[model samples]
Target: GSSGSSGANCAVCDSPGDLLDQFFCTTCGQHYHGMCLDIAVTPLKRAGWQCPECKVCQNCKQSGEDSKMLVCDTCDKGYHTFCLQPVMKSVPTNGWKCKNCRICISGPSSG
Candidate 1:
């Protein structure tokens, strides 16, 4: 095969290959496992289905302007710039991540 590998690790959970198959994002070119989706995404005959990264606004659970959507480099969640507190005025061309990635959560309560 001449083309490069379509990664097996999911964009959402980063889980390695298993019985679950993946849904290729036609927009971003990343692969997300079907099991990682909100519900089990069926591979129906529909030719125009796209991944959540291109469709969902993770913060509000809706969608808006594509130019304003900031997708998490760490996961499948796409946050709308307008949805953030105080709103992000400047859009980073790239390398933006969610608080889930920025906030450090190490260890837990012990006995």
Candidate 2:
């Protein structure tokens, strides 16, 4: 019989605790403290969920950690460009801004 440590360290905060006391993401196999994560996870995990470090599409609401996702140059929000209203086929060489931020400068009422 071998005796091993029963403690799990949170990858997010470096906090140590029992494995049962942490939330594990099956997608990335990373453990996080319940308080370290922002969204409701207990129920979310039942349906297969991604951690915050995972690249989630803001538009389609799907995980694309292994695929390409457009990130807002301003707010840092991730989006599947092809999932947008006017779908984008490739990453912009310059930069990209989400609809919300574009509307901020162009004005919401501008058409």
Each candidate: how many clashes?
Answer: 0, 0
Candidate 2 is scored at a TM of 0.43
What are the candidates' C-alpha RMSDs?
A: 11.7, 9.8
Enumerate residue pairs that collide in model 2.
Answer: none
Please state the error at residue 60 of candidate 2 in Å.
2.0
lDDT of 2 at 66: 29
- In candidate 2, position 57 carries an lDDT of 80
Stretch of 10 with least lDDT, candidate 1: 39-48
Which stretches of model 1 miss by more than 4 angstroms?
Answer: 1-54, 109-111
Candidate with the greatest lDDT versus the true structure:
1
Candidate 1 scores a C-alpha RMSD against the true structure in Å of 11.7
- The best candidate by TM-score is 1
Candidates' TM-scores?
Answer: 0.47, 0.43
Cα deviation of 58 in candidate 1 (Å)? 2.3
